[PDB]
Amino acid sequence: KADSFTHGGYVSLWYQTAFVPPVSGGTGSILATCSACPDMSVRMLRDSPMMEQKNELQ
Amino acid sequence: GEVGKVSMYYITVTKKTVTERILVLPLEMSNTLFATTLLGEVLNYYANWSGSITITFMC
Amino acid sequence: GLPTRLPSGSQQFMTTEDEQSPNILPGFHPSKKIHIPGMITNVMHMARVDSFIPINNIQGEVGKVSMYYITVTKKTVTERILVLPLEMSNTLFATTLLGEVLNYYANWSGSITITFMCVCDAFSTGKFLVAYTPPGGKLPEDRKQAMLGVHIIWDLGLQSSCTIVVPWISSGFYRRTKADSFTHGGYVSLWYQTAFVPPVSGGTGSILATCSACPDMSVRMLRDSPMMEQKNELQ
Amino acid sequence: VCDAFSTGKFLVAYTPPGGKLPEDRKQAMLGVHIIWDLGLQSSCTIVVPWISSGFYRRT
Amino acid sequence: GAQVIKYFNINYYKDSASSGLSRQDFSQDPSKFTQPLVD
Amino acid sequence: GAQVIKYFNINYYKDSASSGLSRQDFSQDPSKFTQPLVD
Amino acid sequence: DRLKQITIGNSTITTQDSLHTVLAYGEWPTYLSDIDATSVDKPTHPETSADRFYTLDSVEWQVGSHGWWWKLPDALKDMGVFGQNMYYHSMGRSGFIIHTQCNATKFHSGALIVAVIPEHQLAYVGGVKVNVGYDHTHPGQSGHQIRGPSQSNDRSGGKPDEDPLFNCNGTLLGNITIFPHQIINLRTNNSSTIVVPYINCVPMDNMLKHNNLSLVIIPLVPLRPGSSGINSVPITVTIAPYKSEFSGAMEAQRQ
Amino acid sequence: DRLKQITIGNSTITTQDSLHTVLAYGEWPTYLSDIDATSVDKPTHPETSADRFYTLDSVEWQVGSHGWWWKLPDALKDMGVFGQNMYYHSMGRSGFIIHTQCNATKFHSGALIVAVIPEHQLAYVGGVKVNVGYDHTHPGQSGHQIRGPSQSNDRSGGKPDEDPLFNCNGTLLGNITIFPHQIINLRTNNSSTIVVPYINCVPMDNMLKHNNLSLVIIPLVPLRPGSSGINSVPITVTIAPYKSEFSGAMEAQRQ
Amino acid sequence: VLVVPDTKPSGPQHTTKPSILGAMEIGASSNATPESTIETRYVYNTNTNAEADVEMFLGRSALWGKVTLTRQYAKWEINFQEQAHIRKKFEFFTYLRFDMEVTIVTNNKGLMQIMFVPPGIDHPETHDDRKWDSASNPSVFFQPKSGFPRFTIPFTGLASAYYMFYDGYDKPKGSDNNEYGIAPTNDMGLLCFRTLDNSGGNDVKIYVKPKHITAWVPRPPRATQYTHKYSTNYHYKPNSSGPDEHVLKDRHFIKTRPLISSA
C-alpha cells in the first residue's frame, strides 16, 4: 500500500523524438504489460483489498 | 469514460512538435494500474514486497 | 513438567476415530478361539457372490418369488425383453448381495458380472442379445442401437447360463452409488437375437438373472445404507 | 503476381478420386490441402499425392 | 507414531491425510508460463 | 520436534521465531564504549 | 525467417509471417498412458483421419467488433471423422493445434488476443440465477460473436455474457495472458499457433457434454484501415486434433 | 540485424535501425594514466552518476534548416552531477558517446551529416577582427541553430559564423568526413553512434573555458515529405560522458 | 526453502543483440532483469517466496460457512462457494486436489453433535430425528467449552482434482434440467448440527483448511464481486422494486484517475 516512507517512484513515458505516421493525421496505440523479475519476493499474506463481499451468496 | 471497456488498456500517440509526457505509472502495487494485473493482484495479498518490476510497452 | 499443547480436536469424541481405551474387567480371560468354517475378512467377498436380481419387480409380482423371473416366448420381431439400468441404488441391484454391500458406500469403481439363466425344458432353444449401453448414451429401444455397445450373444442349450461382463467405463475414477446424471452407469438390456423357440407353439420360458462384483470392484466412504429404516423402538 | 503490399491466405485442396467437387470450403478442406500465406516468397506448391484404387490411372 | 543436529517428522494419527502442511518442496519452474514455446 | 550428562534443545513448533529466549551468549566487550579510541 | 510449416496428416499449414509456436504448459499432446487410465476397454486412435486441420468459417473483423469464442471439442463436432467419433463414443480426449489467421496490409493497424482457456465457464448475461443453456455454449464451428456489454442484451433463454473486458466470466481481460495465448499485431505477424495438450482432471470424458477448451479472439486494439478502403478483414481459425482418443463405442449420441 | 543496445550506467539506448558504431580514431575513452599525468592530486571518478546518457532538447528539422552544433563539455554543463563536477573542479577530462536520433518514414527523404570536430574554432560572422564571444560559443544544451549565410546576419556582439558550407570555420563541408562522422539517410538508418575518446594535447583542462569537441549536424540533403503532411522531423541528441575525470576541487565556478 | 537469486554485477555494455527488445506477441514474458538495463552491483539476496507457495497461500483455514441453530438444529452443505474471499483464492486455479481439516467454532454451550453425512443418503432434518442414530455415518460429539472440534476430510474427487470451473453439463443436449458448472461435478458431503442441551448461542462457524494441495491451471483472479454461488455470474441486480428493475451493476475493483500522464 502506497505511503510516502516506502514509496516506489514513478514510471513515465515521453517522446524521445516523435511518433511519425505515414500520413499527417495518423495515430498509434500503445499497450503496456507488467511482470515480476525473478528476484521479486513477497511476505506477510493478508486479505486482498481486491475482493469485497457486501451480500450473502445463495 | 474508458473504464469498463477494452480501450482502458491502450493510449493514443500522435506526432507532436514538442516532447510531452505521454503516460505516468506511479509505482504502487495498490494502485489500480498495478493492482488489477497478475503481478499486482498477487502482490495485494502480501503486506510488502521487494525486487524488480518489468514493464513492457508495445505500440 | 513437559510443555504440551491441546490442538483442536484433542478433547473431541469422534465416532469414527481409532483410539485405545482402558480395559474394564482386567485379567479377564476370553474363551478360546476355535476353528469355525466360513470366516469372512472383507464384506466385498459377499458382493462377489452371485445373487438373483429381482428383474420382474412390478405392481403384482413384488412380494412373491415370481419377481425373480421373466417370461420369454417366440415372437416374429425382436423385442426388448428386459432393462437393468445400472445403478446400485436401484431396487434391481440394491436388494442383491452386490448392491446391498455397495449401498453402504457412497461411490464405487470396477466391473459388474450379470449372469442370465433360462429355465425351460430341454427342447427349447434361443439366441439372445445382452447389451450394455455405456454411460452417457441413450437407452437403445432398438436392437440395432443396442448392439453398438458392449454386448454378448448367448446361444441357449446344454449349458444353462451366460454372463455379460459390464466393464468399467467411466470418465471419472469412481461412480456414485446413488443415481445421478453426471456419474450414471448406463443400461443393460436383453433382446432376442433370433428367437426363443419352444417344442410346442404356445410354449414359454423363464429367465433369471444374478449379479456379482468382479475382482477389480472397489468401494469407498462407508455411509448409512438406505436399505434399512427404523420408524419404531424395538422392545 | 501482385504488388509487394498485397497479402493473402489461400486454401489449395485436392479432392481425392471418388469424391464430389466440394463447392464449399468446409467440404474442400476435408481432402488433401495446403494453406499458403502470401508474401516475401512468390509461390507455393500443393503436391497432389498418388491416391488410387488401381496401380495406374488412365490418361 | 508413524515415521522418523536432528529432526523428527512424526504422524500421531497414522494417516497421510491427518498430517499437517506439506513443507517439503522441490517441483517448480516458471517456464510452463512466461516461456511456453516450442522453440 | 526440530533439533537435539545430557541436554536437549527441542523446538515444538519448528520455527526459529517460535523458540523461547536465546540463552547462548558469546559476543560481548565493553570497549566499544569506555574505550572508543583510535590509539 | 518467420516461415513455418505444420503438417498434420492429410493437411498442411504454411505460415510465412509467424512467431514461435506456443506449446501450452510446455506440454505436447500424448495418448493416455496406462498409469493414468480408468476405463478398461481398448480405445480407438483414428490418427490421420481425425488428426488433421479443420478450418472453420471465417469471421469478419470490423471496427467495433468485440470478439469471438469457440468451444472445443464442440467446434469440431460436425467436422470430418473426428466429429463422428465424438457421437459414437462415451469418452474421448485430444490435444489441439489452433492456427489463427488474420492478414491485412502494412497500412492497417490492429491487435488481436488469441487465447485458449481451459474450463472457460461463462457467466449468464445478467440478473437472477440461471445456468447458461446448453444450446448457447455449443454453437459448433460457428462459435459466438461476442456482441458487447449492454443493458439491452436479451436475458432470455439462459444466454451467455457478452462483455469481453470481463472475459464473459467476470475476470479482467488483460489477465488473460495467464492462459496460452498469442497476440496478432498487424504490424508484426498475420497468424498464431498454439499447441495445447489434453487438459482435464479426468483421463477422458464426454466430448459432447463437456467443453475442455475455449478459443477466444478479442480485438485488443481496433482495426484501423489507414489509407485504404478496407474496413474489415477476415479471421480464419484452423484446428487440428492431435493424439485424439475415443473409448466406449455406442450408438451415435446424435438425433 | 541493425539492432543495437548501449548501456551506460543508469541509462540504456536501444537502436533498432542502426549502423556500426564509429569509434573515433579507433580509440576508446580511458582514464588518464600515470605516465601522462601532470597534476599531483588524486582525481575523482564519478563513474555511473556522471557517466550516463544525457538527452538534450530536440531540434525541429525542416525544409530550409541549415544545421545545428553543440559544444562539449559545454552542452552537459547543467546536466546531472556531470555538470556539477565541471564547476567544482579546476580540470577535467572525458570521452563521449554521442547518439543522434532522427526517424521519419519510408515516404520521407533526407540526409544528415553528424560529425564530431575536435577544437572546432568558429569564425566571426563577418568583417573586422573580433573574437567570437564566450556567450555565443557556450549555448549549453540548446546548441546553436546555424541560421545561414547572409549579408544581413547581425555582426554585433562577436557572433559566430552562420554558414554551414564552410563549416563556420572557413573550410568546406564535404571534407568534414575527415572527422568522426556518420550520415543519417532516412532511407537507411534513423540514428548514429560515435564513441569519441578524450582528445587534447593536455591531460586535463578547464571544462568551462575550453570546448574540446563540437557536435555538428548538417542537413546534407533537405527533408522531403514525400506524400505525407509531415514537413518537419525532430532530431534528438543524447550524450554519455565516459571515463570522465575531475581534479582540483574548489568552489563552484558558477555564480 | 528457495531464496531468490542474487543480483550479479554488470558494467557498461555495447551489444548488437538487445535483450530489452522483444515481441509481446509471441506469448512469452520478458526475461529482462536489472543486469540487462542498468549497471548493477552484486547484491547478496536471501529473500524467499516460501509464503507465496500454494500450500502457504491456500493453507490458512478460512471460514467457509456459517449456520444458525434454529430449533437446536443446523445443516450445512460443504462448499467454498459462499464466501467471496476464500472463493477468490481457490479460483486462481482451475483444478485443486486437497485434503481439508474442518474446525467448528461455535458459541453454543453444553453438548453438540456433528454428523458428517456422505453423499447419496438422507440427513437428519431435525433434532430428535431418528437418523441422528447412525451405525456408519461418522459423527463428532463435543462440548464447546474446553476445545474446538477438528477433523480432516481426505480428498474425495471422483476425479483426480476438484473442478473450480467446469465448462460442461451433467445431462445431454435436449435435457431441460441441465446444470452448468462444478455443482454436479462433486459433492463433498454435508454437516448436520444439533445441540443436546440448550445453553449458549446458536451460531456455528465452519472453518476449513486446505492441506496437501496440488493446484493446476492458473486463471485470472476474480475481477468482480460474486453474485450467486456455482455461477461466475458477475451481473448484480440491486433491486426488484421498481423502475430500476432490470438495471445491473458489474461491481468491479477498477478505479479511475483524472488524467493519464498526470498520475
Q: What is the DSSP string of I187-235?
A: ---EEEEEESS--S--EEEEEEEEEEEEE--B-PPP-B---STTT----
Total domains in chain G come to: 1
* Three-state DSSP class for residue C126: strand
Give the Cα separation of I187 and I118 in Å (integer).
9
The full DSSP string for B1-59 is: --TTSGGGG-EEE---SS--EEEEEE--TTSHHHHTSHHHHHHTTEEEEES-EEEEEE-
User: Closest by alpha carbon to I88, among I243, I219, I260?
Assistant: I219
Q: Measure the CA–CA gap between I178 and C182, rounded to whole angstroms.
A: 11
DSSP I180: B
In angstroms, what separates the C-alpha of G252 from chain C's closest C-alpha? 8
CB distance from A58 to chain I under 8 Å?
yes
CB contact under 8 A, I99 and E36: no
Q: Which H/E stretch holds residue I85?
A: helix I84-90
Q: Which three cell numbers stand for residue E15?
A: 494417516
Look at A36 and B52 and tell me if their CB atoms are within 8 Å.
Answer: yes
| I-chain residue closest to H6, CA distance | I14
DSSP character at residue I93: B
- Sheet of strand D8-14: strand arrangement: D8-14, D32-38, G11-15, G4-8
Interface touch B51/I47, C-beta < 8 Å: yes
Quick check: H102 and H112 in contact, CB under 8 A? yes
Task: Please report residues of I whose CB lies closer than 8 A to that of C223.
Answer: 117-121, 136-137
Q: Does C178 touch chain I (CB under 8 A)?
A: yes
Contact with chain D for residue G10, Cβ under 8 A: yes
Task: State the Cα–Cα distance between residues G59 and H144, nearest whole angstrom.
Answer: 57
Chosen for mutation from B2, B5, B6, B38 (greatest number of chain G CBs closer than 10 Å) is: B6
Q: G35, G117, G166: which to substitute to probe chain I, counting the most I Cβ within 10 Å?
A: G166
Return the CATH number at H221. 2.60.120.20
Our count of domains for chain I comes to 1
Closest alpha carbon within chain B to I262: B24
Query: What is the C-alpha to C-alpha distance for residues C185 and C86, in angstroms, rounded to an integer?
Result: 5
3-state helix, strand, coil in chain D (%, to 5): 5, 25, 65
Determination technique for this entry:
cryo-EM
Segments forming the whole domain that contains residue I173 = 1-263
Q: Which of H250, H236, H242 is nearest to H96 (CA)?
A: H242
Q: How far apart are CA H198 and CA G241, in angstroms?
A: 65
Position of cell 454378448?
C152
| C-alpha cell belonging to residue C213 | 462384483
Distance CA(H187)–CA(G7), nearest Å, equals 40
Class of domain C1-235: mainly beta
Kindly state the helix (H) or strand (E) to which residue C83 belongs, with its residue range.
strand C80-85
**DSSP track, chain G:** ---EEEEETTEEEEESS--PPEEGGG-------SSS----SPPB--GGGTSS-EE---EEE-TT---EEEEETGGGTTSHHHHHHHHTEEEEEEEEEEEEE----TT-EEEEEEEEEET----BSSSS--PPPHHHH--GGG-EE-----TTS--GGGPBP--TTTTTTTS-TTSGGGSSEEEEETTT-SEEEEEE----SSS-B-TTT---EEEEEEEEEEEE--SSS---EEEEEEEEEEEEEEEEE-S-S--
SS (H, E, C) chain H: CCCEEEEECCEEEEECCCCCCEEHHHCCCCCCCCCCCCCCCCCECCHHHCCCCEECCCEEECCCCCCEEEEECHHHCCCHHHHHHHHCEEEEEEEEEEEEECCCCCCCEEEEEEEEEECCCCCECCCCCCCCCHHHHCCHHHCEECCCCCCCCCCHHHCECCCCCCCCCCCCCCCHHHCCEEEEECCCCCEEEEEECCCCCCCCECCCCCCCEEEEEEEEEEEECCCCCCCCEEEEEEEEEEEEEEEEECCCCCC
Closest CA to G85 of G31, G41, G127, G47: G47
Give the span between the Cα atoms of I62 and I210, in whole angstroms: 9
> What cell numbers appear for I71 in the block?
430449533
State the Cα–Cα distance between residues C172 and I185, nearest whole angstrom: 10
- Any residues with CB less than 8 A from the CB of F30 and at least 6 apart, and which? none
Read off φ and ψ for residue C21, nearest 5 degrees: -130, 155
The answer to whether residues H240 and H54 touch, using CB atoms and an 8 Å cutoff, is: yes
Q: Do G20 and E33 touch (CB under 8 A)?
A: no
Place of cell 506469448: I27
Chain Cα centroid distance, residue G26: 18
Task: Tell me which chain C residues have a C-beta less than 8 angstroms from the C-beta of G44.
Answer: none
| Amino acid found at H181 | H
Interface-testing mutation among G15, G22, G114, G196, with chain E (most E C-beta atoms within 10 A):
G22
DSSP state, residue I132 = G
Mind telling me how many Å the CA of G216 is from chain B's nearest CA?
A: 14
Asked if the Cβ–Cβ distance from B20 to I261 is below 8 Å, we say yes
* Of the partner residues G53, G106, G236, the one whose CB lies closest to the CB of residue D9: G236
Chain-chain contact of D7 with G190 (C-beta, under 8 angstroms): yes
**Minimum Cα–Cα distance from I179: chain G residue:** G131
Q: In G, which residues are within 8 Å of E35 by CB distance?
A: 26
Structural domain for G178, as ranges: 1-255
Query: Using an 8 Å Cβ cutoff, are I213 and I54 in contact?
Result: yes
**How many other C-beta atoms are found inside a 10 Å radius of the C-beta of residue B34?**
21
Q: Which stretches within chain C are classed as H helix?
A: 44-47, 91-94, 97-102, 143-146
Give dist(CA G76, CA G87) in Å, integer: 11
Inter-residue contact I27 to G183 (CB < 8 Å): yes
Amino acid in the structure at residue H243: K
Nearest to residue G210, comparing CAs of G85, G74, G79? G74
| Contact by Cβ (8 Å): D10, D38 | yes
CB pair distance less than 8 Å for I184 and C176: no
The reply to whether residue C15 touches residue I119, judged by beta carbons under 8 angstroms, is no
Resolution in A: 2.8
Spatial CB neighbours of I186, under 8 Å, sequence gap ≥ 6: I156, I157, I158, I159, I162, I163
Q: Which residues have C-beta within 8 Å of that of residue C39, sequence separation ≥ 6? A: none
CB contact H58 to A (< 8 Å): yes
What phi and psi values does residue I132 have, to the nearest 5 degrees?
-65, -15
Close Cβ partners of F26 (under 8 Å, ≥ 6 residues apart): none
Residue at I100: amino acid letter? M
Q: Test H232 with B19 for CB contact under 8 angstroms.
A: no
Asked if the Cβ–Cβ distance from H3 to I37 is below 8 Å, we say no
**Out of A9, A20, A50, whose CB is closest to B15?**
A20
